[PDB]
Write a protein that holds these residues in place. Structure first.
Motif, short mmCIF file in Angstrom:
data_model
loop_
_atom_site.label_atom_id
_atom_site.label_comp_id
_atom_site.label_asym_id
_atom_site.label_seq_id
_atom_site.Cartn_x
_atom_site.Cartn_y
_atom_site.Cartn_z
N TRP A 128 0.83 -1.20 0.00
CA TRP A 128 0.00 0.00 0.00
C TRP A 128 0.87 1.25 0.00
N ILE A 129 1.94 1.24 0.79
CA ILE A 129 2.82 2.40 0.93
C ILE A 129 3.97 2.34 -0.07
N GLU A 130 3.86 1.47 -1.09
CA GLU A 130 4.87 1.46 -2.14
C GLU A 130 4.94 2.81 -2.84
N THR A 131 3.78 3.33 -3.24
CA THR A 131 3.72 4.56 -4.02
C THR A 131 4.45 5.70 -3.33
N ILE A 132 4.17 5.91 -2.04
CA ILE A 132 4.79 7.02 -1.33
C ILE A 132 6.28 6.76 -1.11
#
Ligand code: AMP
Ligand code: AMP
Ligand code: MG
Lengths: 464, 460
Positions: A128-132
């Motif tokens: 989920w926090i890959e993008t950020i």
């Protein structure tokens, strides 16, 4: 800022796509295999600003739920999964992140940080926090590209002078207006400041002070400088008056005066060369006049400017056999400068027997904006999953592109006996054949467990 | 907390001392200097609300900037007195006036898009102080323009190979969230893309539009369920079919995109989709198709090879133009290596092989939102008019070695002839101006909604 709205949309639906009973998703970041080594910098900014503390609230869960309800025209948002984090961990992300110390210069193709969930219920949170987290490509790339330019300046400044005095001020950040946002400006200016101390992007000072800190009063410095508006405001006929007023206002500190408003070659020959020649030869070595061209071919103009100055001011020959301007007169080229043209300029100056001591550079969009994620192939991939009590090494391997093959299993970074770096896969770092893993836990369960001073980062990133 | 006193180029801190004596007015303008022949004006309203409006100067912010600039310059050159004047006289509201063309307007290059001037003579220095903040409008302008130019390419090839423009607004999907330099950029850039299209995965763009612009629709952008490599590869190399089958079953009633190149894209289309799982695909409705996503190799060649393989495993028809069309339950999205150049090559190559554009959608990331510079449209902010010692002067730069760096002169206005071409009148000759006051003395005086902006930015 709402972390539940700060991901790629399709990642909202991924908790329903992993194999059932997946208790761990383990992922890593690398600069996949000029630009042979990268400066790892910027992760701590993301941790402090966006990931640490109570980042999940009842208000943020409601905002995301209603947004995605209309965005997908369907109910797919993992409301219960986010509620669990708020209830069980008081809105703290059950995530562990291990990373190389920031400022470390690591060759391409190595693990730089790893991310895994600490709670089996939160297997979906890792990617989920890959993008950020992938957005750390930008400060990594700015710092890497800035450092490669420092290598260029260091090499040519030594060959033409025999020392590196002032190297940290040879490349000045002019990129504030040319980037895409205020936040981008602060991030990229801070990455430049890993290698240099001259910047006009004030946003970088405030970002360092808040998310890294320094023992020094400020992490960046600048000098008074004119722009075209402050010269042309005196009228076309009063360019001489504009120059004289500005050098007088700033006679105790270095001042830069743009000189190409009407005719750059007339400015250096007539205005600075004769009309105002007395006020140039009279200021200190610590507070010289800096002439700035801003048009024409970058290399041709600086060479033509240097030669005009050589006819009106005493130029000596230094110990290396290269022409050196008087100490009260410098030149900054701050137009059309990127890593390519910078190399071209200093190599051209050396062929003309001009010393790199005479010149400084400013870089705007070329330093902070004309950079992409595919320059260093910054990428985030899952290499290890635990499903129903079984750990499985996973990876991609596209048949039409072996360059996009990803690593396998639990990863570690080790200092080799020769003093280099190697990334071990499939858990082989547990044997510690090459000593201890270099990845340190920097984030665990909503806390920043390990942080670095900007002074430590600068030390780790130094040349040679 | 944001401090506008720390939001400018460092040398602009020392510019209040560099102007001619008795300078009372500085007047500046923004243009896209003279193929992107026309630009969409967009993004200024965001900047106005977030950074310029309201009480933006405080006693604390002045002290912070003073302390920073003392060390930064190693000298006292901060105009603390000037900033205190703004705090005391206007309660920290900026005495500036901004006039701009309406947002979404399509304007040919080399025309004035907005102007900035101080409304208080004590604040002659303030115009170029906020230049740095205002110049960053280059980014949403350039994204919106480049996104619109791609929409022209898509609309032209979709009309030739299909005879209509259905689904156009979903043909170019924003994939740029991870490939941009910051969260704020993702928000600005995605919102600019949404001026022309409705498909996006960059969620930050939805939040920006609802806060600063607003729409009558329940949401400005839409997405569908889709897999990534980690949701496929986590099943094990030998269980790619099980990953596919699980995913299309979890999302059997909505469109679903499944990346199919984890190991062998051509095997996945011929064997896994075209045989083993075909019964799960031919049963889907037209409103919930499978979208096969290649993600490696040459973008145009991989697309053509996937369409060929799918053409033999699924019933292909011919549309009312002579171009092949997959069954309505099967589609393809190319989301690797797509920018305006490679987009053109892909739709050209698909037309060459008689494949309709209806079969394909595109995802663009770094190409749509990051691979762009202020140089693309030559976005420039210049001072064109000053008043010193009570005398007004039309000012401009004109470098001898670069005539393209020339700027306009005097007070400006933007007009349309009765025929339709746009002309920027210089030297105050404008005394109907399309530039409207949008900001004055700390207040936003005119606002536009996202619906209005989309309506202005429509194609012909
Ligand atoms: N401190 C400064 N001194 C002189 N020029 C500057 C400064 N900061 C920004 N600029 C200008 O901003 C431009 C940005 O560069 P670029 O992004 O390469 O177009 C430079 O070329 C300069 O003209
Ligand atoms: N919604 C999405 N669906 C599929 N892939 C995505 C999505 N969002 C981001 N990506 C990734 O981003 C890439 C494109 O961005 P870029 O590499 O910046 O051109 C894709 O090839 C995927 O790896
Ligand atoms: Mg890709």
């Amino acid at each position: 800022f709402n972390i539940l709205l700060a991901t790629d949309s399709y990642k909202v639906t991924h908790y329903k796509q992993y194999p059932p009973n997946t208790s761990k998703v383990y992922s890593y970041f690398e600069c996949r295999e000029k630009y042979e080594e990268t400066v790892f910098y910027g992760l701590q900014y993301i941790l402090n600003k966006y990931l640490k503390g109570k980042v999940v609230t009842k208000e943020k869960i409601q905002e995301a739920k209603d947004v995605y309800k209309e965005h997908f025209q369907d109910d797919v948002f993992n409301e219960k999964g986010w509620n669990y984090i708020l209830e069980k961990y008081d809105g703290h992300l059950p995530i562990e992140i291990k990373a190389v110390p920031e400022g470390f210069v690591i060759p391409r193709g190595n693990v730089l940080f790893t991310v895994e969930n600490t709670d089996p219920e939160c297997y979906w949170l890792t990617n989920w926090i890959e993008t950020i987290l992938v957005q750390s490509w930008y400060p990594i790339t700015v710092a890497t590209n800035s450092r490669e330019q420092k290598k260029i300046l260091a090499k040519y400044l030594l060959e033409t002078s025999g020392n590196l005095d002032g190297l940290e001020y040879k490349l000045h950040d002019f990129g504030y207006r040319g980037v895409s946002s205020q936040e981008t400006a602060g991030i990229g200016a801070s990455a430049h400041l890993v290698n240099f101390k001259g910047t006009d992007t004030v946003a970088g000072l405030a970002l360092i002070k808040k998310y890294y800190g320094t023992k020094d009063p400020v992490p960046g410095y600048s000098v008074p400088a004119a722009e075209h508006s402050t010269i042309t405001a005196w009228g076309k006929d009063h360019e001489k008056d504009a120059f004289e007023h500005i050098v007088t206002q700033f006679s105790s500190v270095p001042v830069s005066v743009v000189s190409d408003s009407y005719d750059i070659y007339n400015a250096c020959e007539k205005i600075w060369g004769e009309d105002l020649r007395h006020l140039i030869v009279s200021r200190s070595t610590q507070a010289p006049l800096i002439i700035r061209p801003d048009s024409g071919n970058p290399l041709d103009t600086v060479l033509k400017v240097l030669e005009i100055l050589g006819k009106k001011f005493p130029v000596t020959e230094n110990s290396k056999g290269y022409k050196l301007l008087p100490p009260y007169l410098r030149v900054i080229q701050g137009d059309g400068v990127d890593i390519n043209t910078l190399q071209e300029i200093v190599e051209g100056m050396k062929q003309k027997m001009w010393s790199i001591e005479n010149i400084a550079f400013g870089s705007g969009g070329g330093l902070l904006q004309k950079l992409t994620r595919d320059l260093l192939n910054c990428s985030f991939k899952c290499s290890y999953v635990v499903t129903n009590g079984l750990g499985i090494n996973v990876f991609k391997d596209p048949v039409a592109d072996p360059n996009k093959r990803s690593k396998k299993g639990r990863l570690s970074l080790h200092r080799t006996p020769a003093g280099n770096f190697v990334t071990l896969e499939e858990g082989k770092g547990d044997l510690e054949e090459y000593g201890q893993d270099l990845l340190h836990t920097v984030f665990k369960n909503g806390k920043v467990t390990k942080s670095y001073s900007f002074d430590e980062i600068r030390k780790n990133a130094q040349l040679n």
